[PDB]
Symmetry: none
Subunit: 262 residues, 4 copies
């Protein structure tokens, strides 16, 4: 009748332990479509200089995103794409900059809600996937005395559960730059719920595959049932790291999102 195609500014946010580097194939694919893409390292992730023992909450961890949104020009809006635990970074960011977010895209991601604790989907994630195989755990005491659990993701868990169908070069890259991370789950349990006016009002698109071997179909479908997304896009095949195994397909879905919300 009237067709529409839109170019957008995507901000890509990795999950804990990883960095901007997992977006190294999706970032060019999106730029081939003419989109502007920013891929940020969160605190103590990728080549960010901080160490995780200096970080005290998931909010503090999210500082690079919030700084970047604080600096966005007047009336510029971005679509925040977050993989895995980064749905929590999208929720933190939307309660401070609802204004600047055209949509949040959850890519095999935690989908927080406003009705329960911020730690709620992390609890459910761990109920669904309680054993992280050869992952190693550590702790430190944060700035107000909370015990924080950090982890060094195991290489078998990396191979078989996160990077299941990925290229040898991609899995090897992951071993060369993977760092420690934390869910800050007990500090999330103490956190104010996400608000209705900020995060609750954001458009939310949920991309996932039922071939994900760590965010399992049962968990993903429970999340979709728990907090209905505005749109759901299920990709066939691939693995947890769809921006590596299904890069073009994820780019085409993200075009659709830009058309609809940006």
């Amino acid at each position: 009748p009237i067709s529409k195609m839109v170019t957008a500014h995507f901000v890509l946010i990795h999950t804990i332990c990883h960095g901007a580097w997992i977006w190294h194939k999706l970032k060019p694919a999106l730029e081939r479509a003419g989109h502007k893409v920013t891929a940020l390292d969160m605190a103590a992730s990728g080549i960010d200089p901080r160490q995780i023992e200096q970080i005290n909450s998931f909010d503090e961890y999210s500082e690079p995103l919030l700084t970047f949104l604080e600096k966005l020009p007047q009336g510029e809006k971005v679509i925040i794409v977050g993989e895995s635990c980064a749905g929590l970074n999208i929720a933190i960011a939307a309660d401070r900059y609802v204004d600047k977010i055209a949509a949040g895209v959850f890519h095999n991601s935690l989908l927080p809600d406003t009705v329960h604790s911020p730690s709620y989907t992390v609890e459910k994630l761990l109920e669904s996937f309680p054993d992280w195989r050869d992952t190693e755990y550590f702790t430190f005491t944060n700035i107000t005395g909370e015990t924080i659990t950090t982890m060094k993701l195991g290489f078998v868990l990396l191979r078989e559960n996160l990077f299941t169908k990925c290229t040898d070069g991609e899995y090897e890259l992951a071993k060369m730059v993977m760092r420690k991370g934390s869910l800050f789950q007990n500090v999330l349990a103490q956190r104010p719920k996400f608000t209705e006016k900020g995060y609750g009002s954001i458009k939310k698109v949920y991309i996932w595959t039922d071939q994900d071997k760590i965010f399992l179909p049962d968990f993903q479908r429970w999340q979709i049932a728990n907090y209905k997304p505005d749109k759901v896009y299920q990709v066939q095949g691939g693995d947890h790291k769809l921006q590596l195994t299904k890069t073009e397909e994820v780019a085409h879905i993200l075009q659709e999102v830009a058309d609809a919300y940006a």
Copy 2:
């Protein structure tokens, strides 16, 4: 077929990650591979300002070699400035090294000071385009010049023929680095008994757009390697653009030296 243990050493500002394609290639031939981050490089936790010389920068390689089990030998492959890491390492552990492989790399000698090929590189390629420079004073008071490689120089000179996913990765994890040139100028020359006695294989391509053809041929003429292999085409990052070729030359190095 000799299977060998290869220790891969990235150049300044980079990290173990530039070998993410070459390490699986070599492991598919049954070789053992170790890819190390040097100090303040890749995900190493130190920042460049706490490193005071190229010998301190080499610490992850020297500690590795320090702990290598008795009677084990490795082939150390160094790209670009990492030939200085090979020479430093070879003077301390000549015993542990089956051969040094120089991959579009500086090839230090024993006759001139440690900074000599750095001076010659800078002479052949003096303008590093959009690279930015910084300085700090190290613990003994020397001014160290650091750099942040410019993205145009990365696109056109280092990663010339690389895939868009590889160039993007490079911009996502590249860090500041230093040649410690002036500290190298003050360093004792590499010894004959250590670095001079090591077997030396030089791999290059004439399509390298930063280690230019006449600098590499100068280097070969200045201090003749045991073997030179020239790969056709590719770019400076042959372990990315010609990964299988480099893996096949390294099988020949393994076969020749174990």
Copy 3:
């Protein structure tokens, strides 16, 4: 008599060494004593430029307390700026601390930001005479001001009545330090449940020539300690000029709090 485990914390630029007279004194009364070097202080191997905040500077104290065996409690004695180390530590390990003792020290509060008493010190004593200042940018981009304490300020203001052997020792091992004032200004206030709940003993002398009488009385008025002991005479380094007095007050703190 309660014997106690005391953790002694020097101020910026100093090291565990300023307690070399007080630690034996206390050990002669059967107490256990730990004297720690903070980051980049005494013989700690780090340099000030790799430290990015006062919380990072406190790391040796926090690691110590992290590892303290379950159910053990300590009395932390902090001199001069080390009251900020007490407050940082108390918010993380309130449980492990029988009391904080402030020895001619900053006494932080919960109501105002962490830099408040630093601002007030600098207001009461703005000219640090021959002290030299330097700056570096920390990893998150803040400019940190460091200082090298001037020897006249050391002789007349800090070590006023100290022996010539003690003043000389001070010049032989003193290092650069930092208040990280601006990072403190951005830090969350000390909590009520942690630092606010700790028992607090304030020891001072009115002959202190850098933490002047009206600044110390201001501090006491601004955030009233559980107990204040005033030593007659001496100087800023009461653990050097009045070592036995300080040891006797610390026995009373041990008796009062274990």
Copy 4:
């Protein structure tokens, strides 16, 4: 007939593992007499920023002394006072700056000679005192592949053998600032002998006590017999650290040295 009293510039050099700090009582006592005193930290000692694993020989370790002598003004001369292993620093310095040295004073110190290897008195020291009790040993490989043995001096050895009669405050100070050190004995074994023209020509005064519990009377007297000092001053009592236990007495002997050579 004619009496003479002279003021001198003393450069005080600590032994391995220690720093300029062991001179904190002798330096004021000498300044009370009107002398100029410089007390230097050698590489990786005292608050010197280098670590011992970055140091590759006893000569490199001696860099702060040599830099300081390179900077001495024209025709200025110093008396170098070295305790324990610092006689080797006096010997290194005298083969480069014989010109600038009025005398070398060996204070319960190694007394190198020119006829044997630089490591020779270290060998004899270890023959005489082979067990360093609770001392811990470590190694690293230096710049040309030599194995270097470093040590962290034990606290019992410190208490009973080096700081035998010292004050509690002095022994405690020593535990608070003692660092790792090395004899670099195998690199000294490979070193050119000390020369006759430089080090062999220096005036040499030997101060010692037979109450020293680590540089034992048998070793000290063997050294005196092996390379006759120009003057020997035996202090009664005290311990290894005569600049702490016999500070005034050592200062009075050093006045005598200044009168005679400076």
